[PDB]
Amino acid sequence: GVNYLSGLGLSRLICLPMALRAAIELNVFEIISQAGPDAQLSPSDIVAKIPTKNPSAAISLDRILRMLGASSILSVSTTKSGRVYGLNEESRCLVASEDKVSVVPMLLFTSDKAVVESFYNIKDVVLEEGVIPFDRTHGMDFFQYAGKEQRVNKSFNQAMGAGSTIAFDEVFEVYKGFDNLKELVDVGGGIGTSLSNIVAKYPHIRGINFELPHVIGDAPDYPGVEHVPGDMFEGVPNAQNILLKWVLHDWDDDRSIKILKNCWKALPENGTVIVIEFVLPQVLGNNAESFNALTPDLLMMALNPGGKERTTIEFDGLAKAAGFAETKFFPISQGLHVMEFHKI
Amino acid sequence: GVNYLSGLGLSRLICLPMALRAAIELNVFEIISQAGPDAQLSPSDIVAKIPTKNPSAAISLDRILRMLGASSILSVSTTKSGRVYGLNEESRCLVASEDKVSVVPMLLFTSDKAVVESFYNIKDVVLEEGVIPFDRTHGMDFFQYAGKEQRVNKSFNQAMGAGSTIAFDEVFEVYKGFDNLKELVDVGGGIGTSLSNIVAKYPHIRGINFELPHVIGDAPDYPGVEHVPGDMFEGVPNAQNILLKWVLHDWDDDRSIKILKNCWKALPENGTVIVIEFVLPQVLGNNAESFNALTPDLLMMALNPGGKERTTIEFDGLAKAAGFAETKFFPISQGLHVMEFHKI
């Protein structure tokens, strides 16, 4: 006794995110917020702000909007003139507010043509050992594909850029392990902008930006930020403390352990490696904490199958395997963790 | 006071359907059913049946599976050895059973590379009047793209083929308006296979398969099925009753009304046009009835923006505009309707 009719509804799964992508690219969500909170708007109202001459723009727009509303991405009320759509707890994070940037750049990256087309081959990871779906799909490394096509390169750096500052704004409120440092080497720090932000919140830290020479060349002079080039696999510059923000998750356990051993060497006694990652919860459910680790884990499955998200248990396992003595875990919010690897 | 952190979870929306596509292509769901009902299986168990030599196949497989389970496409229990996954009311429709075909061909079509890539431009429908996103995306009609690339052509005919027999199996149980006919012209009947099925369930109907000459040529001789070629826009062969299964929804109101007028002419007095469509409910919610009309409506938005799903009210409006006297509505299940346009 099986109802296949309601099976055909599962085609909603591929439709929804593409409905969301359209609404994002049409600024639907900003228009609704610039009309004040608890403001539900009409399609005609919304399209009024959309630069189009199309007669049947409001009609077309609703086809997108009423799918979003059906699956609870917009609040819906039913006037007589038609349906009327506002923001709810899901969609309010699609509009920035002053410098608090939104998740839009991350949603636009993880649904990009290049990424999505590489998701058609994630089964190859199960079937053929060591295969990389993105590289099969496009016949080149992901970063190679960034260099050749700039839309893909720009969305990636915006996504992670956005991503990092959303995460840091919450670690600064909640994580107090920064308050009494005087030196921090960021491993893989880029040009140092994330680090120069940390220095500004905690000026007492003399920051070191450790990064491949070919990156730190262009680096601007940030106050309290010193650039030193190098390869984290040939060694890590000595410093009181180390910072690893979303670096462990790009690597399999072998090269993580390699990284964290090389970390251990530079640290003094009583030194700490700060790790900033999302943490796969011990028990997955339909909740924010879970999906914040499952969806990056699936992205890597397509782009970097060696990379992976990890649990508290597994993270401690990497730390002990590398030689670290004690591990403390400070959950921030939604599965984001700050973790310290202590050398005692 | 906005939590952007849980915003990053919305990237789950594009991940999920691609996780579902992988599991489908790996036969995950059949493997689980061939192990008996209420059988939750381990990743290692499932991959045991998967033809791979990859050492870390079970590990990789879980990355897909635990996303499906997190969003309730699989039932999940937590043994000590790991997680264990069964079918629930959502996923049981992904396995056929004897001739009862599953929704798999439809899910595989609506998530196909060609379709999905054309979903990146559905906003163009709002912006530029009369633009067709699929034709912009691929620089050719959809059916042209079927002819050139056969994977896309084969999935389409399987999808609708599947789709039609799932729908008919429910109309035969519930719709009794077939029991006392003796003639039925199917408008747009193809080679007649859907119609030759109807004749078999109701032999007393002398069936007529009305279709473009270039289709009905290859047509096999089905008992109780007569082929006559023609163009529904230049006229419809005279018959006691007419059948319109998923034809009205491909056309805007003008050409629907054109079709239904041309229908009216051939019918006698007391004749009926049977319409088989899904019906956009007057009030959309997160339910099967809604999504069974919203998702085809969004597909057409990408492939056939002139086509559209309609409500009971709107369907009656097409019938009265064409000259029909009375309209009866018989909901089957999940938003599927059989509707008769009466000529009295």
Assess whether B249 carries a catalytic annotation. yes
A174 interaction partners in chain B (CB closer than 8 Å): none
Interacting residues of B1 by C-beta distance below 8 A, sequence separation 6+: none
Q: Which two tokens stand for residue A98?
A: 């002053």
Where helices occur in chain B by DSSP H, the ranges are 12-25, 28-33, 43-48, 57-70, 104-110, 113-118, 123-127, 133-138, 142-148, 150-174, 193-201, 213-216, 253-266, 288-303, 312-322
Judged by DSSP in three states, A300 sits in: helix
Residue B336, φ and ψ in degrees, nearest 5? -65, 135
CB contact under 8 A, A110 and B14: yes
Contact A339, A186 (CB under 8 A): no
Q: Are strands A225-229 and A206-211 parallel, antiparallel or unpaired?
A: parallel
Residue A70: closest CA among B39, B65, B6, B285:
B285
Catalytic, out of A138, A249, A337, A342: A249
A191 and A126 in one domain? yes
Q: How far apart are CA A301 and CA B19, in angstroms?
A: 11
User: Residue A295: enclosing H or E segment and its boundaries?
Assistant: helix A288-303
B139 and B226 in one domain? yes
B214 and B112 in one domain? yes
User: Shortest Cα distance from B78 to chain A (angstroms)?
Assistant: 8
Residue B15: closest CA among A309, A153, A32, A33:
A309
Answer yes or no: is B127 within a domain: yes
Q: How far apart are CA B344 and CA B329, in angstroms?
A: 16
Q: How far apart are CA B132 and CA B145, in angstroms?
A: 14
Q: How far apart are CA A106 and CA B309, in angstroms?
A: 33
Contact A301, A125 (CB under 8 A): yes
A109 and A88 in one domain? no
Interhelix angle for B312-322 vs B253-266, to 10°?
50
Please state the length of chain A.
Answer: 344
How big is the CA angle at B338 (ends B332 and B341), to the nearest 5 degrees? 155
- The enclosing domain of A232 has a CATH number of 3.40.50.150
DSSP A88-130: -TTGGGGS-BTTB--SHHHHHHHT-HHHHHHGGGTHHHHHSTT
Give one word for B130, left, alpha or beta, with left for phi > 0 and alpha for psi -120 to 50: left
User: Shortest Cα distance from B302 to chain A (angstroms)?
Assistant: 10
Judged by DSSP in three states, B109 sits in: helix
Contact B330, B277 (CB under 8 A): no
How big is the CA angle at A301 (ends A298 and A305), to the nearest 5 degrees? 150
Answer yes or no: is B26 within a domain: yes
B1 CB neighbour count, 10 Å cutoff: 3
CB contact under 8 A, B126 and A297: no
A185 and A81 in one domain? no
CB contact under 8 A, B26 and A126: yes
Residue B52's closest chain A neighbor by CA? A127
CB contact under 8 A, A123 and B305: no
B19 interaction partners in chain A (CB closer than 8 Å): 122, 298
CB contact under 8 A, A110 and B5: no
Q: What is the 3-state secondary structure (H, E, C) of A171-183?
A: HHHHCCCCCCCCE
A194 CB neighbour count, 10 Å cutoff: 22
B147 and B255 in one domain? yes
CB contact under 8 A, B6 and A334: yes
Q: Which two tokens stand for residue A118?
A: 């590489």
User: Shortest Cα distance from A147 to chain B (angstroms)?
Assistant: 22
Q: How far apart are CA A12 and CA B71, in angstroms?
A: 14
Interacting residues of B241 by C-beta distance below 8 A, sequence separation 6+: B181, B183, B184, B185, B267, B271, B272, B273, B274
Residue B241: closest CA among B277, B278, B204, B213:
B204
Residue A91: closest CA among A157, A19, A151, A43:
A19
For residue A31, CA distances in Å to A23, A35, A52, A166, B123 come to: 11, 7, 14, 22, 16
Q: How far apart are CA A127 and CA A129, in angstroms?
A: 7
The residue range of the domain holding A186 is 104-342
A149 and A284 in one domain? yes
Residue type, A300: M
User: Taking the alpha carbons of B232, B304, B111, A284 in that order, is the dihedral positive or negative?
Assistant: negative
Boundary of a domain, candidates B94, B120, B145: B94
Answer yes or no: is A216 within a domain: yes
Interacting residues of A326 by C-beta distance below 8 A, sequence separation 6+: A342, A344
User: Shortest Cα distance from A6 to chain B (angstroms)?
Assistant: 6
B134 and B197 in one domain? yes
A and B: number of Cβ contacts within 8 A: 287
Q: What's the DSSP call for residue B324?
A: -
Answer yes or no: is A99 within a domain: no
Task: Quote the longest CA-to-CA distance of chain B.
Answer: 71
Q: How far apart are CA A166 and CA B323, in angstroms?
A: 60
Interacting residues of A54 by C-beta distance below 8 A, sequence separation 6+: A60, B126, B127, B128, B129
CB contact under 8 A, A15 and B110: yes
Q: What is the 3-state secondary structure (H, E, C) of A177-200?
A: CCCCCCEEEEECCCCCHHHHHHHH
B336 interaction partners in chain A (CB closer than 8 Å): 5
Nearest by CB to B64, which of A22, A64, A122?
A: A122
B145 and B25 in one domain? no
Q: Are strands A74-78 and A272-278 parallel, antiparallel or unpaired?
A: unpaired
Answer yes or no: is A63 within a domain: yes
A184 and A157 in one domain? yes
Q: Which two tokens stand for residue B76?
A: 């999940």
Answer yes or no: is A128 within a domain: yes
Give one word for B245, left, alpha or beta, with left for phi > 0 and alpha for psi -120 to 50: beta
Interacting residues of A9 by C-beta distance below 8 A, sequence separation 6+: B288, B291, B292, B295, B334
Nearest by CB to B14, which of A17, A128, A169?
A: A17
Interacting residues of B206 by C-beta distance below 8 A, sequence separation 6+: B182, B183, B184, B224, B226
Q: How far apart are CA B170 and CA A3, in angstroms?
A: 9
Boundary of a domain, candidates B94, B114, B140: B94
Catalytic, out of B138, B227, B249, B337: B249
Where helices occur in B2-112 by DSSP H, the ranges are 12-25, 28-33, 43-48, 57-70, 104-110
Q: How far apart are CA B127 and CA A330, in angstroms?
A: 48
Answer yes or no: is B151 within a domain: yes
Nearest by CB to B11, which of A64, A110, A127?
A: A110
Residue B3, φ and ψ in degrees, nearest 5? -100, 100
Contact B156, B324 (CB under 8 A): no
Nearest by CB to A2, which of B4, B97, B290?
A: B97
CB contact under 8 A, B297 and A63: yes
A108 and A41 in one domain? no
Boundary of a domain, candidates B56, B73, B94: B94
Domain count, chain A: 2
A174 and A82 in one domain? no
Interacting residues of A14 by C-beta distance below 8 A, sequence separation 6+: B17, B110, B111, B116, B119
Q: What's the DSSP call for residue A131?
A: -
Answer yes or no: is B219 within a domain: yes
Residue B119's closest chain A neighbor by CA? A18
Q: How far apart are CA A163 and CA A144, in angstroms?
A: 22
Judged by DSSP in three states, B341 sits in: strand
- The enclosing domain of A77 has a CATH number of 1.10.10.10
For residue B330, CA distances in Å to A41, B47, B171, B338 come to: 34, 45, 10, 5
